[PDB]
Amino acid sequence: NDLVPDQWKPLFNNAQWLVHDIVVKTIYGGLIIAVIAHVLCWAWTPWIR
Amino acid sequence: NDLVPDQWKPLFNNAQWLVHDIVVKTIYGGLIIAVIAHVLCWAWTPWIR
Amino acid sequence: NDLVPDQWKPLFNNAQWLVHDIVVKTIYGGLIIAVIAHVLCWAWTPWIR
Amino acid sequence: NDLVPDQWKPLFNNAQWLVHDIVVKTIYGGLIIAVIAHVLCWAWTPWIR
Amino acid sequence: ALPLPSGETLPAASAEVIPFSIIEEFYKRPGKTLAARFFGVDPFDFWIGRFYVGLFGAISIIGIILGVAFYLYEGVVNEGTLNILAMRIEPPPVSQGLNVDPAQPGFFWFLTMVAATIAFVGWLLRQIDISLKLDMGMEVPIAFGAVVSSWITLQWLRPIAMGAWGHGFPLGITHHLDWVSNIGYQYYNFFYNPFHAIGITLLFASTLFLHMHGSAVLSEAKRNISDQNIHVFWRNILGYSIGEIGIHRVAFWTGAASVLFSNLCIFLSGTFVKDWNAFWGFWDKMPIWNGVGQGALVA
Amino acid sequence: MNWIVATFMLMFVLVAFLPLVVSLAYTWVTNP
Amino acid sequence: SPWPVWSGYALCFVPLAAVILGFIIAARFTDKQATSAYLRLDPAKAN
Amino acid sequence: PASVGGYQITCATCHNGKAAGLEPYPIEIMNTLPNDWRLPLELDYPGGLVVTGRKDVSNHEVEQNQFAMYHMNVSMGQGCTFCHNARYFPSYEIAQKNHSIIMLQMT
Amino acid sequence: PIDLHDEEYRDGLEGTIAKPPGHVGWMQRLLGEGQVGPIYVGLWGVISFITFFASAFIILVDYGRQVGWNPIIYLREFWNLAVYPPPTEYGLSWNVPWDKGGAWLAATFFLHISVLTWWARLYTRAKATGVGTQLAWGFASALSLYFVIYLFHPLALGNWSAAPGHGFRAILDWTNYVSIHWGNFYYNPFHMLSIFFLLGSTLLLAMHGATIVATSKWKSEMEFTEMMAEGPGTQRAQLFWRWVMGWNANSYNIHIWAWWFAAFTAITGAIGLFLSGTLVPDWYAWGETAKIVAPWPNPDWAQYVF
Amino acid sequence: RPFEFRTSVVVSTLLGLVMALLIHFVVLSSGAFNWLRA
Amino acid sequence: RPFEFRTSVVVSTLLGLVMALLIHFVVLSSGAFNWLR
Amino acid sequence: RPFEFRTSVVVSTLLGLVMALLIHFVVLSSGAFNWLRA
Amino acid sequence: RPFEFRTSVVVSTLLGLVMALLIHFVVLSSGAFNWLR
Amino acid sequence: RPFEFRTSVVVSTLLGLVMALLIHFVVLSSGAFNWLRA
Amino acid sequence: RPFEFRTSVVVSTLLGLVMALLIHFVVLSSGAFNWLRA
Amino acid sequence: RPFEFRTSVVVSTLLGLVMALLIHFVVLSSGAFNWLRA
Amino acid sequence: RPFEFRTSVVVSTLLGLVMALLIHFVVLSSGAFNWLR
Amino acid sequence: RPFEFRTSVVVSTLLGLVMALLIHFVVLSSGAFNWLR
Amino acid sequence: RPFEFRTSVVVSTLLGLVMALLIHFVVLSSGAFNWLR
Amino acid sequence: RPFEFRTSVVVSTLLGLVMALLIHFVVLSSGAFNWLRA
Ligand code: BCL
Ligand code: BCL
Ligand code: BCL
Ligand code: BCL
Ligand code: BCL
Ligand code: BCL
Ligand code: BCL
Ligand code: BCL
Ligand code: BCL
Ligand code: HEM
Ligand SMILES: [Fe+3]
């Protein structure tokens, strides 16, 4: 756990930090795309009325 | 893992790097082809209207 | 693995290289025949319209 | 089996005598209540006629 | 390297590499069949190839040959179909009764059914003899006897009890299904027959038990384990392990019980009952709830 | 319906049930 | 029209022949493995 | 046809010895069915209760068909094969199914 | 590298409960073992428990509502109560009243989650005990049939009404209705193959059980030890089945035979059920066109009349 | 002794409970007392 | 002692809960009190 | 200590997810909000 | 002690949740409050 | 530590996939969006 | 000798008895003799 | 010796008896001879 | 040798007998000879 | 490492193939494109 | 080597025989050639 | 290496053959090509 920050050393391993970063970046990209898709769908036709 | 880059050494093997690279190129070609196919299909007949 | 190139030595064996070459050539010929057949069928009867 | 009477020693334990007494008292109370309830219900509506 | 029964080749117990010929020769021990006890001698007490032929082996083979000949004759001749998926081998008409006449149609159905019954009983007795020669138990004969009793119920007891003898099944491929369908819909909701439901439950349980036992035994064949891993695995999931000897007992019992209840339901449906929906009319009239409802919730 | 013959055939069926019951009883009597 | 349809051909007669051949082949190889020579306990000593 | 006989309909056919208070759908015949089921007399019976391979209906229509069919069974005492061959229900071969068509139109 | 004592006697989550084993007695006399023993709970099984009991609670509460909340009538009509899917109109929509199919969808969803988590539990415990994972794939082959019945068949038909109604009597009605709708499954070839495999499975189970019990005087039931070296009981069983029908197997092949019978039963059933409605609307007509239907001009119909 | 106290207690309590429930249900269904809306 | 405290507590609690539920359901379903419409 | 953090977290997460799904299903089926369908 | 803290907590939580869900379902089905249409 | 990274990843991925499939099916089967011929 | 005397005796007696029973049954079933009202 | 004498005798006897039974039954059922009531 | 005399004799005899029975039955079924009524 | 390359490859390939087949069949059965008549 | 000669020969022969029989039967049943009446 | 050559070859061959048969069936069943008597 050389690369793990001091705060999260008891919970994380050096190999797991990289996979965690990849997962977080994927989630943030997916959230942005989902927000855009929801905005376009609402502009197309509202679902609440 | 001599040919593996320094950053990704703890996660990858020497033989796994080549297979991963092949899969990455395959995914990139498939994505380009799928984008083209979707554009032509939309130009032919919209599915949302 | 004497006949295998340097790049693919960890992945391939001297015996598997020849069979891989055979398979690659077979797939190339199959793709050529498939393209010709598809062009002929399109010339005969279009399926998209 | 100090508390168990002489006749009932071969069947009962010292601990089961008290539970048997409790069960007997409960059954006697239940029979008294049942007799009262049956008399009340007969005074309300005869079920033989 | 020592070859294991599974197929492993493990480099090196009191075991040794023994050909099957020695075992086959050692365990012959002629002269202990059922017919030998009765008559003092078995007329056929030898082997023809890998098979053992006894007194009842001859009877079984005669029945098999005669039944196959009669079956082919009724279906190739007298029908002129020439294919086996369109043959329709019928018993005599219900009007004829319990009597048999060679001139009237349906006689070769009688011949085939009698020959098949003889062959089945001969096979059962041959199994008993082979079991008795090896000093084994009589479990396989019990299971097969359950199956043979299932046959006898359908082809002998029900037609005699109903008394017209046209109530037995045609022996045709894809055509006994027609008889099953018509009989099942004549007594409508054959699902609602209790013994049919018990038999279906036992059949499904038998299949599930077979799959579970096969998986459990196959999951430990070629591994370095201590023989107690399977017990811990079966106690961690479902919290119970039956053991080695209990699973086979359960299998045999479930298999026999399914067929027994099935033949019971078929016979009972034939004669003592007419409708399986009317059989349940007693339920709602019992004097614990016959007065508690209103409107559609009455009864 | 002749009810004597039907009851006889039913008795034969219940007899056919017997061998499994005998096997169960034998297994219970042994293994004490 | 003395012949069945193509769907009948496939759905009926391909699985039937497949089942028959598979059963015969599996029985033959099971018997071959069963009758081979491997470790066994000697019947003379074993009781 | 004359095979059935020549029986006629009279007062006792429907009344059966009662002046009034007739009971169509009594409780004893409503055994397996829902207690508020009635015959669907708003349909065209030459094709009213057809379900085989329709592909525009589902299990609910089959359930309604089964209710009607069991009612037809109970009203007689001959079981489901009286008018049908169980190998193929759509078949018209038993000769009491056309009689049932005429009866349905009459009802 | 695997300590069975640890895998059977841990505490907390990822451990076991009911740790002091019970004893039944009569199961020890009749079956040879009567230890109730501890049971594992490891986050694959808590989810199954919660989801299955949520589904059961939904179904039971709907049962109660259908009888006007009368407990006596609840006992009266328990076995003929059901929670049916939405009617044929509004085929695959979820905007349905709770009493017109709303509860069926939720219960079915929770049941799907429960069965998937149970498969995960089986796989994980097989891995953690050191044994193989054949049971997981057998359960997968049965879940294939289950998912064809409940999910994949109602899809591609266009309605939820093609699925069973969650009742004791509703499954029997579903079987009858599906048979009547699509012709006759007696002429469905995959129904025939499934029946062949099912009856073969029952036959094989009976034969194996009887064979092992008959030779149990020589310790033939210890399959794990016999796979190392054959004993007198296995030799007697092989000789018996060789002298009866001319061929036999050893104590290792029969299990492969049984596993493949059960797997083929499940797979062929699933394929036949899926193919029943989408491609062949009438099985009897197909059988007639395939020349597998026997001619039947002049029946004797007096057998079928009262 | 022929029977233990525990088995006797269990059997007696179960029999009493089942009999009480059965009698109450039968009397309710009989409709002969005008109890709980007739 | 013939019975443990644990068993007695469990049986009593289950019996009481079941009886209370049954009595409430019977009273609600009878429709003789004008409660909950 | 009576319970581990793992068991509490798992039970709480599962209960929350199941409750949310059930409430959403019931609200959708009631049809009292004019949402996702007329 | 006859019972442990863990068992009591589990049983109480399950009983409370089950009772609350049952009461909400009965109240919703009764149709006597004008709730959710 | 309480939970492994593997278990969290597996549960999160499976839950996301299941929820995506269910939401797509519910939204598209509602017939309120006019997607692929109404 | 290929066959023993007692084996031949058993086989011959059994075959003769079976054939006699079969011939009486077939003749009776034919109904061509007016025997037992036939 | 390729075959034993007893096997040959037994097989021949079985085949002959089966053939005789089959031929008599076929000829009786064909009704082409006027034997045993036509 | 690959095949024994006994196996060849058995296979040949069984095949011949089965073929003779099949041919006689088919010829009888065809009804093209005016044989046996 | 938490996950091996082989398992990820297998799961990705299976998911992709299943999704491709499902989407093709859904689009074909929708009948909104005039494809294959 | 990855595969042995016997396996290749067996698979090829089985596939060829199956495809040949299937194609002849499909063509015969199609009734588009005027073959065998 | 993550995967052996045999596994790749077997999976590829099976997938190709199954896909070819399925595509031929789906194309020829549609009746939109006029092949082999319509
Ligand atoms: C209304 C008039 C009805 C009728 C209605 C009922 C009903 C209703 C019941 C009986 C019961 C009985 N009836 Mg009456 N019965 C009728 C006519 C008859 C006739 C007759 C010839 O006509 C006879 C012989 C009987 C005879 C009997 C007995 C078998 C029995 C009562 C005695 C008993 O067992 O006490 C022994 C009983 C006990 C020891 C019970 C003790 C219970 C204890 C006291 C606990 C009570 C609950 C309390 C809340 C617990 C609280 C504490 C917590 C547990 C911590 N009935 C008519 C038709 N009868 C009762 C019975 O017990 O049936 C099994 C019963 O429930
Ligand atoms: C309204 C009039 C109704 C009727 C409605 C009801 C209802 C409704 C109930 C009873 C109950 C009972 N009825 Mg009444 N009952 C009627 C007529 C009768 C007649 C008769 C001859 O007419 C009789 C003999 C009885 C007899 C009885 C008893 C068996 C019982 C009450 C005593 C008891 O068990 O106390 C002992 C009870 C206790 C010790 C309860 C203690 C509960 C503790 C305090 C917990 C309470 C809940 C609280 C929220 C907990 C919170 C904290 C959390 C635990 C963390 N009823 C009529 C028809 N009756 C009740 C019962 O319990 O039946 C089994 C019951 O539910
Ligand atoms: C529309 C009006 C409806 C209604 C619709 C709903 C719906 C729909 C829901 C509720 C929910 C709840 N309702 Mg409301 N509700 C109504 C009326 C009521 C009434 C009342 C007496 O009138 C009451 C008391 C309540 C009470 C409640 C609570 C029990 C609960 C909200 C608090 C909570 O638990 O937060 C605790 C909740 C959380 C801590 C959630 C945290 C979630 C985290 C942030 C993740 C979110 C997902 C996100 C995509 C994750 C992204 C990253 C990836 C994981 C990588 N409702 C009316 C009838 N109500 C909700 C519920 O049950 O929640 C469990 C719910 O879903
Ligand atoms: C019918 C008229 C009213 C109505 C009338 C009432 C009334 C009256 C009441 C409620 C109450 C409640 N109502 Mg309501 N309610 C209505 C409509 C709603 C709607 C809706 C969708 O419309 C919702 C979501 C709710 C929701 C709720 C809850 C917030 C609450 C009950 C909580 C509960 O389950 O406690 C039971 C829960 C438990 C026993 C579990 C607790 C678990 C804790 C919180 C978490 C940790 C668990 C721990 C880790 C476990 C450890 C052990 C494990 C074994 C490991 N109401 C309508 C509008 N509602 C009740 C209330 O106020 O409660 C406070 C109440 O009395
Ligand atoms: C059209 C408008 C519809 C509707 C249609 C949908 C549909 C359809 C979906 C959602 C989804 C979601 N909806 Mg919406 N939704 C509506 C109204 C709402 C409302 C509301 C009004 O209150 C809310 C609160 C939400 C909330 C939500 C979220 C839970 C979620 C989107 C964010 C998210 O989780 O991102 C977190 C998501 C991610 C991190 C995913 C990232 C995935 C990455 C990008 C890979 C994707 C797969 C791709 C094929 C990969 C290709 C390469 C290969 C891997 C090699 N919806 C209305 C009714 N909504 C989506 C969802 O995810 O549901 C679970 C979804 O599928
Ligand atoms: C009625 C005219 C019928 C007909 C009716 C029958 C009948 C009936 C039978 C034959 C049989 C045969 N038929 Mg012719 N047959 C017909 C037309 C033909 C035609 C033809 C081209 O038309 C041919 C080629 C044949 C050919 C044959 C032979 C296969 C065979 C007779 C020879 C034989 O086996 O000798 C070799 C025979 C033996 C060596 C037998 C020896 C038996 C010993 C002597 C014992 C006799 C029994 C005695 C009771 C024993 C007592 C023992 C006690 C201890 C005392 N049939 C027409 C259609 N045929 C017979 C046969 O054997 O079929 C298998 C037979 O049963
Ligand atoms: C009537 C004209 C019918 C017809 C009716 C039959 C019938 C009926 C039969 C044949 C049989 C055969 N047919 Mg032709 N057949 C026809 C047209 C043809 C045509 C053609 C293209 O037209 C061909 C190629 C053939 C060809 C053949 C042969 C395959 C075969 C005869 C030779 C053989 O194999 O002997 C090999 C056989 C032997 C060497 C047997 C020797 C048996 C010994 C002599 C013992 C006999 C039994 C003995 C008496 C029993 C008692 C023993 C005791 C110890 C006493 N047939 C027409 C349509 N054909 C026969 C056959 O055997 O088929 C397998 C047969 O049964
Ligand atoms: C519907 C309109 C057209 C039509 C349109 C097309 C089009 C368009 C195409 C075809 C293609 C093909 N068509 Mg078409 N086709 C028509 C009518 C027909 C008819 C017919 C009787 O009418 C036939 C028989 C065929 C036949 C064929 C094949 C020759 C070919 C696909 C082969 C294949 O499976 O590749 C897949 C096979 C494999 C992946 C397996 C290969 C195995 C090798 C050969 C052997 C390996 C052995 C070794 C031991 C194995 C080792 C591994 C083992 C696991 C141990 N077509 C109609 C008239 N057809 C395709 C083509 O041309 O392909 C080149 C194509 O694209
Ligand atoms: C009538 C016109 C029909 C049609 C009828 C048939 C029939 C019928 C057959 C084919 C066959 C084939 N068809 Mg074409 N076919 C049609 C249209 C097509 C179209 C198209 C796009 O239109 C295509 C691409 C094809 C393609 C193909 C090939 C896949 C194949 C031939 C090559 C091959 O594999 O040889 C490889 C084959 C061999 C090497 C066989 C060698 C056999 C040896 C010589 C032995 C023969 C048997 C002999 C008796 C042995 C005797 C001695 C003993 C061994 C001791 N067909 C049309 C619709 N086609 C044949 C095939 O093989 O299908 C699987 C086949 O049977
Ligand atoms: C017995 C319970 C029973 C069953 C089952 C049954 C089935 C059935 C079906 C499936 C149909 C329709 C199938 C189709 O595609 O047409 C159908 C139709 C009719 N039946 Fe029926 N039937 C059962 C019982 C009976 C009985 C006892 C009779 C005669 C009184 C009878 C008759 C009819 C008639 C008439 C029809 C035609 C319905 C119509 O055309 O609308 N059925 N049955
Ligand atoms: Fe075993």
Numbering used by the authors:
A (entry chain E), B (entry chain G), C (entry chain I), D (entry chain 6): 7 to 55
E (entry chain L): 7 to 18, 29 to 315
F (entry chain Y): 1 to 32
G (entry chain Z): 12 to 58
H (entry chain C): 161 to 267
I (entry chain M): 335 to 640
J (entry chain 5), L (entry chain A), N (entry chain D), O (entry chain T), P (entry chain R), T (entry chain H): 4 to 41
K (entry chain 7), M (entry chain 9), Q (entry chain P), R (entry chain F), S (entry chain J): 4 to 40
Give excerpts from the publication.
Roseiflexus (R.) castenholzii is a chlorosome-less filamentous anoxygenic photosynthetic bacterium. It contains only one LH, which forms an unusual RC-LH complex. Each LHαβ non-covalently bound two B880s and one B800 BChl on the periplasmic and cytoplasmic sides.
To investigate the LH-bound Car numbers and its correlation with the light intensities, we anaerobically cultured R. castenholzii cells under the light intensity (32 μmol m–2 s–1) used for obtaining the reported 4.1 Å RC-LH structure, and also a high and a low light intensity at 180 μmol m–2 s–1 and 2 μmol m–2 s–1, respectively. Superposition of the high illumination model with that of medium and low illumination gave root mean square deviation of 1.753 Å and 1.765 Å, respectively, indicating these three structures share the same architecture, and light intensities did not affect the conformation of the nRC-LH structures. In particular, the LH ring bound 15 KγCint, 14 KγCext Cars, and an additional KγC that inserted between the LHαβ1 and c-TM in all three structures, indicating both Car compositions and assembly in the nRC-LH were not affected by light intensities. (A, B) The structural models of the interior keto-γ-carotenes (KγCint), exterior keto-γ-carotenes (KγCext), and a KγC at the LH ring opening in the nRC-LH complexes obtained at low (A) and medium (B) illuminations were fitted in the electron microscopy (EM) density map.
